[PDB]
Amino acid sequence: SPTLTIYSGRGQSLVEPLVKQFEAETGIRVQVRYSTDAQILAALQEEGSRSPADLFWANTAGALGQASAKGLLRPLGETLLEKPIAFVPASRTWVPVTVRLRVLAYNPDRIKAEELPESLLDLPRFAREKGLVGRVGWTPTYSSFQDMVAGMIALYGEEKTREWLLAMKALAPKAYPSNPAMLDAIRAGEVDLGSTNHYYVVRFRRAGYRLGMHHFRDGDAGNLALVTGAGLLKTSKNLAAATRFLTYLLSPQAQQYFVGNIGEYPLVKGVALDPNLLPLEEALAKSPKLDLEKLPLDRALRLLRETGVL
């Protein structure tokens, strides 16, 4: 009888199995609307008080940060917010659910782990010295790559970041429409290395492909933490169910699904970790300690276009 409406910037293949389970166990009917974080935000603002949405389940902390600044999200209580091990916003207006890391994927047949640079800023120099012109991959249109560039701006400033983009560009990189395309090219020997999200490498490894995964020095922009999460909209007329659903996402079983089915890092204990993941404390220490709700994404896209990468 009760009904719950979720606006999701997370992919249907990821979301649907969990919502189906939630429905089966609670008897609560769930309707999900799928889009990008950006146009969900736009939609909610356009719909205003007339919105049927109870929850915004987002792919990025940045988008939840935007929703919160726009006044769309309810403050949350301590019983829920104390569950995740990290990444709870100061605003207390959403709950982090998983984290993912930027990493450097590489072909072990052509690249020695010991050899790779400790900082992303030194990548182009490495690529030059190793003669990898035409043999570096990247995904300029991919959300998380754009976040990573935004983190570089926050951390190093625009000039330094522009110098990095132009140095990368001078490597004659190959651009890929998606991360699996790029990792396939790595597999194939078309490129030797490329920055990606850790779970893509996990998925390839699980399929039998032994791609290298390189982490930069703790705090380096190349290890940017990519936080997902969900928030309860003020327009919700189903508060108990919506809160029940948020709680469910942080449950050990659902968190095991994120680790197993999806390959992402969980934000709670009580789960079995894939051997391809760092211990959680190490994973958590990799990223720069940035305000993840304030990444200068707009500045990032701009630099990416100015430099002619996008």
UniProtKB/TrEMBL annotation:
InterPro entries on file: Ferric-bd (IPR026045), SBP (IPR006059)
Family: Belongs to the bacterial solute-binding protein 1 family.
Protein name: Iron ABC transporter, periplasmic iron-binding protein
A GO CC term assigned to this protein in UniProt: outer membrane-bounded periplasmic space
Top-rank taxon, per record: Bacteria
Binding site for Fe cation: 199-200
Annotated keywords: Iron, Metal-binding, Signal
UniProt: Fe(3+) binding residues: 142, 199-200
GO molecular function, one term: metal ion binding
